[PDB]
Amino acid sequence: LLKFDDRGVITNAVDCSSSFFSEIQCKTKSLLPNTGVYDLSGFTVKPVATVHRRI
Amino acid sequence: SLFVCSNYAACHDLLSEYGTFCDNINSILDEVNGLLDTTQLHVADTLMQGVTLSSNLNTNLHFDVDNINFKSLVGCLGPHCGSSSRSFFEDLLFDKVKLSDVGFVEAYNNCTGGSEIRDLLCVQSFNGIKVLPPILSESQISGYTTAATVAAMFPPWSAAAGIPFSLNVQYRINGLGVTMDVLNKNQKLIATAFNNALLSIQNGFSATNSALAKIQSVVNSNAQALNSLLQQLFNKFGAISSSLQEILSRLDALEAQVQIDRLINGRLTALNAYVSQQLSDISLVKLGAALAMEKVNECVKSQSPRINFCGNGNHILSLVQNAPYGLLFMHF
Amino acid sequence: LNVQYRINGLGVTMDVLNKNQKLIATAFNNALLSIQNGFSATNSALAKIQSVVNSNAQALNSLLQQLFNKFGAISSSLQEILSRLDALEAQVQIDRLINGRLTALNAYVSQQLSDISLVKLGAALAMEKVNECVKSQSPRINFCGNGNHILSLVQNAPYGLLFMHFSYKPISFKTVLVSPGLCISGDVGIAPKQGYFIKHNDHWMFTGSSYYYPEPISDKNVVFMNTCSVNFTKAPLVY
Amino acid sequence: SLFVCSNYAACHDLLSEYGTFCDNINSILDEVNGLLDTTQLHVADTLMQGVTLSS
Amino acid sequence: GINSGTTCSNDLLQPNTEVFTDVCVDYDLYGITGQGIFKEVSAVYYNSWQNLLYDFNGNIIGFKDFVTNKTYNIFPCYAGRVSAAFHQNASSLALLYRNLKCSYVLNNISLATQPYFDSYLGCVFNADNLTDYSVSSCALRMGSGFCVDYNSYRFVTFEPFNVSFVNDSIESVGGLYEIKIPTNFTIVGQEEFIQTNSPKVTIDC
Numbered sequence: 001l002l003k004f005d006d007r008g009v010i011t012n013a014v015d016c017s018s019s020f021f022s023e024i025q026c027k028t029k030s031l032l033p034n035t036g037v038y039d040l041s042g043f044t045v046k047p048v049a050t051v052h053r054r055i
Numbered sequence: 056s057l058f059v060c061s062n063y064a065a066c067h068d069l070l071s072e073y074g075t076f077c078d079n080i081n082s083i084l085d086e087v088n089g090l091l092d093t094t095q096l097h098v099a100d101t102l103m104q105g106v107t108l109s110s111n112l113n114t115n116l117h118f119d120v121d122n123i124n125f126k127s128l129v130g131c132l133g134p135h136c137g138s139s140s141r142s143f144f145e146d147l148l149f150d151k152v153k154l155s156d157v158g159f160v161e162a163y164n165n166c167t168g169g170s171e172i173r174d175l176l177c178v179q180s181f182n183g184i185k186v187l188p189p190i191l192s193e194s195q196i197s198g199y200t201t202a203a204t205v206a207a208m209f210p211p212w213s214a215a216a217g218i219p220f221s222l223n224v225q226y227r228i229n230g231l232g233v234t235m236d237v238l239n240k241n242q243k244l245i246a247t248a249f250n251n252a253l254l255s256i257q258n259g260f261s262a263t264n265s266a267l268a269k270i271q272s273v274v275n276s277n278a279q280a281l282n283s284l285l286q287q288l289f290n291k292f293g294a295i296s297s298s299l300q301e302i303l304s305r306l307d308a309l310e311a312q313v314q315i316d317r318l319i320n321g322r323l324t325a326l327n328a329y330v331s332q333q334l335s336d337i338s339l340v341k342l343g344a345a346l347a348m349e350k351v352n353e354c355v356k357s358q359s360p361r362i363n364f365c366g367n368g369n370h371i372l373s374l375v376q377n378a379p380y381g382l383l384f385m386h387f
Numbered sequence: 388l389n390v391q392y393r394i395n396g397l398g399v400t401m402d403v404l405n406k407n408q409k410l411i412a413t414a415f416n417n418a419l420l421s422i423q424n425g426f427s428a429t430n431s432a433l434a435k436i437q438s439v440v441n442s443n444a445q446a447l448n449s450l451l452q453q454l455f456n457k458f459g460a461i462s463s464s465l466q467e468i469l470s471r472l473d474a475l476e477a478q479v480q481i482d483r484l485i486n487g488r489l490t491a492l493n494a495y496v497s498q499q500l501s502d503i504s505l506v507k508l509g510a511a512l513a514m515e516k517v518n519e520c521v522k523s524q525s526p527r528i529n530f531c532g533n534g535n536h537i538l539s540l541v542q543n544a545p546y547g548l549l550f551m552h553f554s555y556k557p558i559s560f561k562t563v564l565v566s567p568g569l570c571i572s573g574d575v576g577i578a579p580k581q582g583y584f585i586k587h588n589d590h591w592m593f594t595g596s597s598y599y600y601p602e603p604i605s606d607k608n609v610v611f612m613n614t615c616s617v618n619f620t621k622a623p624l625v626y
Numbered sequence: 627s628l629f630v631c632s633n634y635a636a637c638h639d640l641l642s643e644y645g646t647f648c649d650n651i652n653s654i655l656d657e658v659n660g661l662l663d664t665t666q667l668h669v670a671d672t673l674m675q676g677v678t679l680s681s
Numbered sequence: 682g683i684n685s686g687t688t689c690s691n692d693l694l695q696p697n698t699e700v701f702t703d704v705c706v707d708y709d710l711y712g713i714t715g716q717g718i719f720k721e722v723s724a725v726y727y728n729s730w731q732n733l734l735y736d737f738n739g740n741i742i743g744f745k746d747f748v749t750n751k752t753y754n755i756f757p758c759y760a761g762r763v764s765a766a767f768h769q770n771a772s773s774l775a776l777l778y779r780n781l782k783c784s785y786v787l788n789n790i791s792l793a794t795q796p797y798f799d800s801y802l803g804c805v806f807n808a809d810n811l812t813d814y815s816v817s818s819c820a821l822r823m824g825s826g827f828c829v830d831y832n833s834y835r836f837v838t839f840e841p842f843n844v845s846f847v848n849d850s851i852e853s854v855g856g857l858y859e860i861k862i863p864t865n866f867t868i869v870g871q872e873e874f875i876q877t878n879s880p881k882v883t884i885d886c
């Protein structure tokens with residue numbers, strides 16, 4: 001997220017992936033989002049092993 | 056992020072082109088949910104309009120007045136009404152059907168352990184289709200209904216124009232052209248008749264009934280809509296297959312863009328159609344809530360002079376009890 | 388006189404309404420001034436007006452933002468795709484963009500019909516509300532305002548109507564013994580039309596349901612009963 | 627079976643991919659038809675509410 | 682017979698890895714790719730020609746080993762969603778995993794870094810509970826009568842409305858009743874805005 005001032009200079013930026021706060025911050029395109037219940041989708045687990053079966 | 060594309064980056068990158076569609080979908084779902092929340096809050100507010108309870112009042116101590124039995128209608132016996140306010144009638148209603156908010160929460164909690172696969176809620180929840188619980192639990196609504204009833208029947212009679220229940224019935228019968236001479240002598244008989252009618256409607260849920268049919272109809276309609284929406288993921292939509300894994304593992308990802316685009320377009324079209332019917336049913340339930348608004352405010356706390364509006368015929372009065380996804384009444 | 392008569396419907400004593408004329412006028416003026424200057428801070432009416440205006444603007448912005456979607460094509464600007472391709476293979480990209488825009492238009496008109504039906508229902512609600520609470524007072528308990536409703540006024544508002552539901556509200560109470568029914572003769576009972584029956588110095592009096600004002604028992608404030616119930620106060624010492 | 631494809635097998639075979647669409651269309655049409663029937667029955671019932679004729 | 686069968690390539694060397702149970706891992710299944718949770722169970726419906734089982738849609742929910750001859754039931758993995766409760770004045774987030782006990786989350790999903798608390802809807806984070814309290818109106822409504830607020834983050838039951846109480850008798854003592862009759866009043870005028878008209882719009886192709 002790139003915020004610009006009156007002279008086209010970057011003031012603050014959001015990582016969007018550091019934590020849930022970054023995702024909520026760049027979801028509404030605002031540096032400080034308003035008080036609300038924001039949903040963060042895409043939550044899932046990852047595999048920890050690989051099983052291979054053949055003949 | 057989970058319906059059209061479950062956990063594939065190749066599918067999530069292409070979703071950026073239709074970001075406005077997903078944003079609009081989330082916005083309309085959030086506003087209809089807020090509308091439902093406002094309607095629920097309005098119902099909870101109208102139940103507590105001008106009601107006044109007594110601290111010394113104990114329904115567990117006194118549970119009978121003027122030879123009228125109402126134990127099956129008043130919940131949380133005693134002044135510790137903070138654990139379970141479900142009355143006997145509400146308990147029977149919630150026992151007939153188990154797909155309430157509590158049942159949904161318990162079903163989702165039971166999905167952690169893989170002890171069952173026949174339940175469709177797990178395959179539905181794993182695909183981004185979840186049923187969130189309402190803002191106010193059914194226990195709070197049940198407590199509100201029993202509080203309104205006990206206040207409308209015991210002093211202070213807030214929802215009875217400051218008149219006792221027996222006198223309220225005796226005066227409501229006079230409005231339908233009756234002689235006051237026979238109402239005084241027929242006191243025990245009218246009380247037994249009222250108790251018999253209450254017991255008849257209480258045990259009348261054994262066989263089929265109109266109320267049970269409507270409750271099962273709305274629950275089954277919601278389940279059918281969810282199943283139809285979930286079944287859309289198994290449509291080829293003119294592609295080689297409906298499984299994203301097979302397409303991603305069979306093609307070289309250079310010509311699979313057209314198949315993925317076709318599947319995405321079909322799923323988005325189905326989503327748009329579903330949210331259209333969603334707005335339609337939201338408007339319908341809002342109108343039903345408005346009907347309940349005037350029905351309660353004009354037939355429970357008082358009796359508006361509207362011929363054949365509350366019940367069907369020579370209406371006397373009505374009561375209110377909690378029901379799953381709605382309200383239930385006793386139109387005597 | 389309309390206010391003086393509307394207050395009587397909510398069980399009040401007419402003796403205090405005549406003496407409390409200047410006070411009720413000042414109270415009405417104060418309530419009007421309070422609702423008049425109550426728009427300084429946040430309010431429910433202002434929130435609804437700003438909500439409908441912002442919702443309309445948001446819908447228009449979302450519809451306008453749809454023109455900047457690639458829709459699977461090379462770019463969302465027609466000029467670049469027209470000046471970049473030879474117009475022989477650009478038909479598929481133009482067709483895809485056209486299909487996406489038409490789909491968005493169909494969705495927008497669907498929500499348009501939905502909100503049109505919603506505002507139509509709201510207009511109907513305003514129709515009965517005005518016709519039953521402005522030009523007169525229909526006997527519907529808790530329908531116009533919220534509580535002991537008196538009357539209402541109507542003023543123009545942006546994209547709708549606004550009302551001032553003046554409702555009766557007490558500030559202090561008092562506990563007194565009451566009796567809903569009592570027999571006055573040989574099974575010849577009576578009943579208060581609007582209020583209760585109180586005891587004061589071994590003789591009964593009638594009072595209103597909203598103002599503690601004892602009044603002598605008279606036929607103009609009681610309902611005659613040919614026969615009374617057993618569970619009534621036995622007070623045969625009457626006129 | 628008659629609107630999108632009138633009497634062509636080449637068109638009917640491809641219709642199987644969007645079978646859920648046709649099923650949902652038939653379901654919603656039957657639902658609105660049943661709703662209309664219930665409204666008509668309700669009107670006919672309220673007309674004969676407490677009516678009493680003489681032979 | 683794509684992604685199913687016996688005769689196939691050996692370019693990517695990979696030995697016959699042993700099957701694992703109760704883990705959300707990826708599999709091969711002699712060609713049938715995908716990821717899931719394997720569970721051990723004993724079946725009898727399998728026959729000589731029968732060596733795999735599907736569902737009504739076509740998904741796989743179980744199979745029989747080719748050499749081990751051990752029945753295994755395939756269960757779907759967990760791909761839910763986490764909610765949040767962010768306040769304007771606050772600097773933290775009240776993360777909540779709906780309908781998921783945080784014990785399984787701490788041992789197989791995340792790590793205990795913030796003060797957790799097991800609740801009715803699941804397990805909240807960055808907040809402690811104060812269910813004995815009651816808030817008239819909460820800015821955030823988590824659901825089922827439970828809300829959060831910033832002060833820091835708490836967990837208080839939502840009670841939007843409640844009836845007042847009066848310490849008065851309810852029995853007909855002395856043949857009369859005790860009631861609260863008002864003695865003074867005033868006029869209070871509320872307001873309500875009803876939307877009637879909407880801004881007309883026109884769109885042309």
Ligand SMILES: *[C@@H]1O[C@H](CO)[C@@H](O[C@@H]2O[C@H](CO)[C@@H](O[C@@H]3O[C@H](CO)[C@@H](O)[C@H](O)[C@@H]3O)[C@H](O)[C@H]2NC(C)=O)[C@H](O)[C@H]1NC(C)=O
Pocket residue numbers: 005006
């Ligand atoms: C960058 O863009 C934002 C958004 O357009 C600008 O915020 C805007 O600032 C103006 C003045 O600071 C606000 O105007 C207000 O008008 C009312 C009514 O006339 C007046 O009472 C206020 O005192 C104020 O002047 C305007 O509301 C505000 N926009 C929003 C959406 O709140 C901002 O100024 C821009 N910054 C630069 C450097 O251009």
Ligand SMILES: *[C@@H]1O[C@H](CO)[C@@H](O[C@@H]2O[C@H](CO)[C@@H](O[C@@H]3O[C@H](CO)[C@@H](O)[C@H](O)[C@@H]3O)[C@H](O)[C@H]2NC(C)=O)[C@H](O)[C@H]1NC(C)=O
Pocket residue numbers: 729747748749750
């Ligand atoms: C897993 O299951 C398979 C399927 O039954 C087992 O293969 C079976 O092994 C037995 C033992 O050798 C075979 O029986 C043999 O039949 C021949 C006649 O063809 C007979 O001459 C031999 O004396 C012997 O009885 C059986 O045919 C064979 N079935 C198939 C379909 O190949 C396998 O042994 C099992 N493995 C484990 C570890 O349990």
Ligand SMILES: *[C@@H]1O[C@H](CO)[C@@H](O[C@@H]2O[C@H](CO)[C@@H](O[C@@H]3O[C@H](CO)[C@@H](O)[C@H](O)[C@@H]3O)[C@H](O)[C@H]2NC(C)=O)[C@H](O)[C@H]1NC(C)=O
Pocket residue numbers: 799800801810811812813
């Ligand atoms: C939320 O925090 C409370 C700390 O107060 C945890 O303990 C729970 O406290 C409440 C009352 O504060 C208990 O409710 C009642 O407790 C009395 C005994 O004091 C009991 O006789 C009643 O039947 C009723 O249960 C509650 O039981 C108690 N919880 C436990 C497990 O004992 C509470 O655990 C925290 N919430 C959660 C979900 O853990």
Ligand SMILES: *[C@@H]1O[C@H](CO)[C@@H](O[C@@H]2O[C@H](CO)[C@@H](O)[C@H](O)[C@H]2NC(C)=O)[C@H](O)[C@H]1NC(C)=O
Pocket residue numbers: 119120121122123242617618
């Ligand atoms: C008059 O009031 C008395 C109470 O003083 C009533 O007597 C009780 O009524 C309850 C109501 O169900 C019964 O459960 C009790 O068994 C009654 N007790 C006795 C000693 O009778 C009486 O029923 C009332 N009568 C009328 C006509 O309202």
Ligand SMILES: *[C@@H]1O[C@H](CO)[C@@H](O[C@@H]2O[C@H](CO)[C@@H](O)[C@H](O)[C@H]2NC(C)=O)[C@H](O)[C@H]1NC(C)=O
Pocket residue numbers: 161162164165170171
């Ligand atoms: C989750 O579902 C299982 C399976 O139905 C439930 O286990 C049952 O528990 C009851 C009482 O605890 C027993 O009478 C049944 O025999 C159990 N079923 C089986 C198949 O053994 C379990 O209670 C459910 N849990 C929740 C929280 O809903």
Ligand SMILES: *[C@@H]1O[C@H](CO)[C@@H](O[C@@H]2O[C@H](CO)[C@@H](O)[C@H](O)[C@H]2NC(C)=O)[C@H](O)[C@H]1NC(C)=O
Pocket residue numbers: 770831
């Ligand atoms: C959140 O922070 C704002 C900003 O400080 C608080 O608003 C202040 O509230 C006090 C209390 O009345 C006022 O005296 C200040 O003038 C307010 N300042 C501003 C800028 O509005 C607000 O109260 C805080 N809310 C919570 C829940 O902590």
Ligand SMILES: *[C@@H]1O[C@H](CO)[C@@H](O)[C@H](O)[C@H]1NC(C)=O
Pocket residue numbers: 691692693
């Ligand atoms: C070629 O195939 C044989 C038999 O499948 C195998 O032993 C050998 O390792 C393979 N070589 C390579 C380079 O894959």
Ligand SMILES: *[C@@H]1O[C@H](CO)[C@@H](O)[C@H](O)[C@H]1NC(C)=O
Pocket residue numbers: 703788789
């Ligand atoms: C992960 O879950 C499995 C079963 O669900 C369990 O056996 C294992 O102990 C868990 N992991 C840890 C580290 O506890």
Ligand SMILES: *[C@@H]1O[C@H](CO)[C@@H](O)[C@H](O)[C@H]1NC(C)=O
Pocket residue numbers: 815816817818840841842843844845846
């Ligand atoms: C009603 O609830 C609020 C908080 O929700 C509380 O502050 C108030 O004391 C309650 N009223 C009672 C218990 O009479």
Ligand SMILES: *[C@@H]1O[C@H](CO)[C@@H](O)[C@H](O)[C@H]1NC(C)=O
Pocket residue numbers: 848849
């Ligand atoms: C009721 O409670 C209030 C405040 O606790 C007290 O002032 C009053 O005396 C009480 N009345 C009775 C009858 O107990």
Ligand SMILES: *[C@@H]1O[C@H](CO)[C@@H](O)[C@H](O)[C@H]1NC(C)=O
Pocket residue numbers: 558864865866
């Ligand atoms: C009612 O209260 C107001 C202010 O609270 C006071 O000025 C007025 O005198 C009171 N009325 C009576 C009859 O005491």
